[PDB]
């Protein structure tokens, strides 16, 4: 096993030259420094560890270093350099896996003055250097301040434009923290058994003697990084053709929304910022019902629908304000935002939405710049146009010239089937078969005694995730009276659910106690074992069920999207826009895959189902898992 | 003895008044305006002959004040035949208002 870290000129988008890199070998126990002319020998040293069957240690390498060394080897040395997924490890991913609960713990470390406040939550190398006491100095701050005082300002990352002997030394600095962070993660025996020294083993042994989550996470981070580089094809013109129709609607409404009113001070107010609707409704005679913790009256979509005033003009204007705020939201996400979609469209015509894998307590990843996991759906206004802008048809084939086709496959009722799995231990697969028998929402309706099946649908998820008795009662238009009795009745007709909280409470935990209206829910065990065996720190026993199921559901999907692509590669298909298919977006339980021909998409749909059954078989799931696929051009059709 | 103005009745009662018109651009939520309000009541009685006191509430009549660029209130405007003779902003005292009026008349 070898440990390394590199230095380039810029980020993955416009990286052109390799500066330096250091490789510490655990067999030689000595560092090796490389320089911009030693780039060729650097690639050889990594291949040697691949030839021996060892491992290559990078921090943020699965997302940056390894694909950059793939990109840099093509334009500088004109050689193909690709590190296999099996013999490369990313400490950054392990950090997000092993120590998802650390800050948290860092509160005392933050109070200590040992850990910078700007690195409060970062799994980055610099954030870890102070934690290990190996930070002798940061190259990010020792350059910026030198730009102010020693002449000539700067804008965004210029400390990498060219090599310097201080960079060569801070490249070493990045390596020794990477080594020490690796050993800090290998010393956690919940994932890495003590009987095996993972610092001196082959790649075949490393994955197998480690916890299953360790293997998945490196497969997951590698896969999702490909999706980011795959990107989501984007019809720029279409969103532009909407900003015109919305800004005109905003401008025409803005003109009309100054026709009803009517305002050391001046006056110009328009529908935005809490001092707007609050200032006019308190002139149309509106008495606020629900307030907030700061004192200000609640002005959300809920209360606005019920705002009734004696003034017909003011009343009819409410619906005009309702439209305005919604117009700004779509505009503020697709055009008028700091993270607007139009700003992230690269030169290829695709949006490369980033994704932080299991760097999210339990399961589903986090998406940003832009958040691909909050594009308005087809059921919301103007969402049909929005979802249509994210489609494989917006990327023509680099060869045939044909518009690619999109395949949308989701996990059918993943949440309740995960629930059926943990409660099949007490009812002997009763609830699990009710899923297969169909209409589980009909049975939950009878079990909880609800008037409509839709009332059962909104009940089962809220109840499972720790909802009050008021909120449950508000489903049928009541309060905690009907709420308490609705939940207690559901528990009596579904014994297994209550018995599930026995096995969980008998795992074991502590005991709780109420003191005069304060929830003092303590606990002894604040970590649930997952399906892959990882620690899921969860929260208080007040809910926890939601975390257990969502951990189950999202970890299933992680293996699901991994096994599908492995089978697609196994079946012979090629991943990448120069191949046959490309992962575009992963949303909780659904994924969007670009496909060169409709025929390829059909195999994808079948393959996705085959992987979902293999996952269910692998972990011996007590309930049956299934998926449904939809073929089409864009996202509005595949969902 | 003070005239309360609207936006429609500002063109005739003030600009076409042909005389001395002191208009207070005031408001209900201003602190210094509540302070000059008792003063203007007494000014209307004493100056009843060579000057007319008038008040415009900028909340119920939001169209007049912009045309005179109100950057602060209370804003006293001594109108002289449709023209603005002198302007002063802020709560003047009874002695300070008297000095102002006797100087411009």
Swiss-Prot record, chain A:
Residues binding Mg(2+) 2, per UniProt: 5, 7, 174
Chain segments carrying region 3'-5'exonuclease: 1-187
Sites where the protein binds Mg(2+) 4: 410-411, 589
Binding site for Mg(2+) 1: 5
InterPro entries tied to this protein: DNA-dir_DNA_pol_A_CS, DNA-dir_DNA_pol_A_palm_dom, DNA/RNA_pol_sf, DNA_polymerase_A, DPOL_T7, RNaseH-like_sf, RNaseH_sf
EC numbers: 2.7.7.7, 3.1.11.-
Catalysed conversion reaction: DNA(n) + a 2'-deoxyribonucleoside 5'-triphosphate = DNA(n+1) + diphosphate
Protein residues bound to Mg(2+) 3: 410, 589
Gene Ontology biological process terms from the UniProt entry: DNA synthesis involved in DNA replication; DNA-templated DNA replication; double-strand break repair; viral DNA genome replication
GO function terms (MF aspect): 3'-5' exonuclease activity; DNA binding; DNA exonuclease activity; DNA-directed DNA polymerase activity; metal ion binding; nucleotide binding
Region described as Polymerase: spans on this chain: 202-639
Residues bound to substrate: 441, 453, 457, 461
Pfam families, A to Z: DNA_pol_A (PF00476)
Cofactors named for this entry: Mg(2+)
Keywords: DNA replication, DNA-binding, DNA-directed DNA polymerase, Exonuclease, Host-virus interaction, Hydrolase, Magnesium, Metal-binding, Multifunctional enzyme, Nuclease, Nucleotidyltransferase, Transferase, Viral DNA replication
Family in the record: Belongs to the DNA polymerase type-A family.
Known role: Replicates viral genomic DNA. This polymerase possesses two enzymatic activities: DNA synthesis (polymerase) and an exonucleolytic activity that degrades single-stranded DNA in the 3'-5' direction. Non-processive DNA polymerase that achieves processivity by binding to host thioredoxin (TrxA). This interaction increases the rate of dNTP incorporation to yield a processivity of approximately 800 nucleotides (nt) per binding event. Interacts with DNA helicase gp4 to coordinate nucleotide polymerization with unwinding of the DNA.
Subunit details: Composed of two subunits. One is encoded by the phage and the other is encoded by the host thioredoxin. Interacts with DNA primase/helicase; this interaction is essential for the coordination of DNA unwinding and nucleotide polymerization on duplex DNA. Interacts with the ssDNA-binding protein. Part of the replicase complex that includes the DNA polymerase, thioredoxin, the primase/helicase and the single-stranded DNA binding protein.
Protein name: DNA-directed DNA polymerase
Natural source organism: Escherichia phage T7 (Bacteriophage T7)
From Swiss-Prot, chain B:
InterPro entries, sorted: Thioredoxin, Thioredoxin-like_sf, Thioredoxin_CS, Thioredoxin_domain
Residues of the site described as Deprotonates C-terminal active site Cys: 24
Ranges for domain Thioredoxin: 1-105
CDD domains: TRX_family
Record has Acetylation as a keyword: yes
Residues with site note (Contributes to redox potential value): 31-32
One cellular component (GO) term of this entry: cytosol
Alphabetical list of PROSITE patterns matching this protein: THIOREDOXIN_1 (PS00194), THIOREDOXIN_2 (PS51352)
UniProt cross-references to Gene3D superfamilies, sorted A to Z: Glutaredoxin
Pfam families: Thioredoxin
Disulfide bond positions: 30-33
Swiss-Prot/TrEMBL keywords: Acetylation, Disulfide bond, Electron transport, Redox-active center, Transport
Residues forming the catalytic site: 30, 33
Domain of life from the UniProt record: Bacteria
GO molecular function, one term: protein-disulfide reductase activity
Keyword Cytoplasm attributed: no
An individual GO BP term: cell redox homeostasis
Modified residues (N6-acetyllysine): 67
Family under the similarity heading: Belongs to the thioredoxin family.
Task performed by this protein: Participates in various redox reactions through the reversible oxidation of its active center dithiol to a disulfide and catalyzes dithiol-disulfide exchange reactions.
Oligomeric form and interacting partners: Monomer.
Protein name: Thioredoxin 1
